[PDB]
Design a binder for this molecule. Structure first.
Ligand code: PP9
Ligand code: Z0P
Ligand code: OLC
Ligand code: OLC
Ligand code: OLC
Ligand code: OLC
Ligand code: OLC
Ligand code: OLC
Ligand code: OLC
Ligand code: OLC
Ligand code: OLC
Ligand code: OLC
Ligand code: OLC
Lengths: 157, 156
């Protein structure tokens, strides 16, 4: 087991894709106007939390990718990352709060699955995913309360 | 041989970019863009991407069973994420120049995945060849969309 920079940088570069979804966000009166739960973090917290999570999830995947039988785990990892990438444009760009809730719940499921499969192969890789599952849980809660606490207009059928 | 749990996991992962296409059907904005002469008709695209989701998932299923496939699957994760990113940037936000950067990075990781797949399993490499071809065409379309509509602010 090693600090493998080819692996680590590949997984980190892959995080550049969800990172870009956040980068292309702007101040948005729609978002500012939303009713929010008391425990909602300020806007500046989210890029810092996500950057930390990108590094942790990449290091976890780096460890696992060096182990025999890691195929299912990395398939879950690929799914987790793609739904993560999908969520921000659906919620912030398309303003489809209901569809975004479906997306983040699928994300949550593949984050949980990835974490479970990582623990099966390597404890530290599983542990690194725990703050990710926790943040994903909070993020789902925010999407849900956003839906519950506000006016929602119909999406396209 | 055939590992259904693996294949279905990879196929499910394709549900994410497949969803971007479902939620962002080509705009009246898109139809009014100046198109390069070789632009395919609209029905070609969901045909192409649906086929590619099945081919790339088949390829990944084969590779994920093999020893030493970690770097290959890391590339696969990378290309899928940038694939998922591209449609919302181009069709959603209509930032054509940013989208070009995204699809070029996508292209690189599709090429890297293909190469990596070939080192481990010839058939998985072959399944990625039409993907690299299509990503090349997509990159060209995105480049031409800019070049041919440079008077639009969203092209620059
Ligand atoms: C005040 C300005 C910004 C706010 C509130 C912001 C908030 C968010 N950014 C998100 C996505 C993101 N923003 C991110 C980095 C950035 N974030 C940026 C600007 C902002 N991004 C810029 C600019 C970034 C580029 C460095 C990243 C990296 C993500 C990716 C989230 C994900 O799903 O991976 C998400 C979705 C996930 C969640 O709810 O936990 C929120 C809420
Ligand atoms: C949008 C930001 C994403 C970064 C864009 C850079 C992507 C370039 C594509 C790389 C293709 C790899 C080359 C394939 C052929 C090499 C031979 C081979 O395929 O086999 C080599 C031998 O194992 C593999 O070498 C490598 O692993 C090189 C890949 C390194 C990945 C790029 C790292 C970029 C640094 C990350 C910076 C931070 C990112 C943002 C943080 C959120
Ligand atoms: C919302 C975010 C909340 C969490 C924020 C945390 C802030 C970052 C601190 C953690 C450092 C973790 C270190 C992880 C690096 C260890 C893995 C690794 O380096 O492995 C090396 C190689 O595998 C040989 O063992
Ligand atoms: C050992 C110490 C470790 C330190 C490592 C670096 C920490 C970087 C982030 C700090 C804040 C993290 C939690 C942020 C909670 C924000 C709550 C809030 O709303 O504060 C807004 C602020 O008051 C507006 O002026
Ligand atoms: C379950 C609690 C998780 C919630 C807390 C979230 C904060 C970030 C946690 C990261 C754990 C890793 C940090 C400690 C560094 C690990 C050292 C390492 O992994 O080294 C491997 C090798 O076996 C020896 O060096
Ligand atoms: C407002 C929302 C705030 C956040 C809400 C809280 C989120 C709860 C998440 C749970 C993470 C706990 C996961 C712990 C799983 C550990 C599994 C384990 O350790 O299994 C190891 C074993 O060796 C295998 O073989
Ligand atoms: C166009 C792309 C759209 C994407 C849509 C893709 C949806 C795929 C998910 C199916 C879940 C079905 C769950 C069935 C899981 C069965 C697992 C299994 O039985 O595996 C056996 C194992 O391989 C024995 O060794
Ligand atoms: C288009 C809308 C989005 C569509 C997306 C559908 C989301 C549901 C995902 C499918 C289930 C994936 C099936 C994977 C089951 C594998 C379970 C498994 O293999 O367990 C691990 C194994 O035991 C240890 O190696
Ligand atoms: C490792 C990272 C490598 C990948 C990063 C690649 C980034 C390239 C991005 C392009 C920005 C836009 C510049 C492209 C301009 C093409 C359109 C053009 O301007 O056409 C000429 C004129 O506008 C018509 O008359
Ligand atoms: C288990 C290790 C942690 C894993 C998960 C990492 C999550 C921590 C990251 C940032 C949260 C800080 C933001 C918290 C700010 C809450 C919003 C707030 O400021 O509300 C104040 C209210 O008025 C009275 O509490
Ligand atoms: C389907 C699986 C999604 C399961 C995701 C679980 C989402 C939990 C929602 C949540 O914990 O919200 C925090 C709560 O609202 C704070 O008071
Ligand atoms: C490829 C095989 C022939 C394509 C079938 C075709 O003509 O599709 C028409 C389109 O659906 C009309 O809206
Ligand atoms: C515009 C730029 C155009 C560039 C387009 C090319 C990009 C990919 C380069 C190499 C492909 C070949 C990858 C295979 C490398 C050797 C594979 C080998 O091991 O053999 C394969 C198979 O398993 C039995 O031959």
């Amino acid at each position: 087991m090693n600090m493998d920079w080819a692996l680590f940088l590949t997984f980190l570069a892959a995080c550049g894709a969800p990172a870009t979804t956040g980068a292309l966000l702007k101040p948005d009166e729609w978002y500012d106007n939303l009713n929010k739960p008391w425990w909602n973090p300020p806007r500046w917290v989210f890029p810092l939390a996500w950057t930390s999570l990108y590094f942790l999830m990449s290091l976890a995947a780096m460890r696992v990718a060096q182990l025999e039988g890691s195929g299912q785990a990395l398939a879950f990892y690929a799914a987790q990352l793609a739904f993560n990438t999908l969520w921000t444009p659906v919620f912030f760009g398309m303003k489809r709060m209901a569809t975004a809730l479906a997306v983040v719940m699928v994300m949550w499921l593949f984050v949980a699955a990835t974490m479970w499969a990582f623990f099966q192969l390597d404890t530290w890789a599983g542990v690194l995913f725990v703050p990710y599952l926790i943040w994903a849980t909070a993020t789902t809660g925010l999407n849900f309360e956003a839906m519950r606490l506000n006016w929602n207009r119909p999406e396209a059928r």
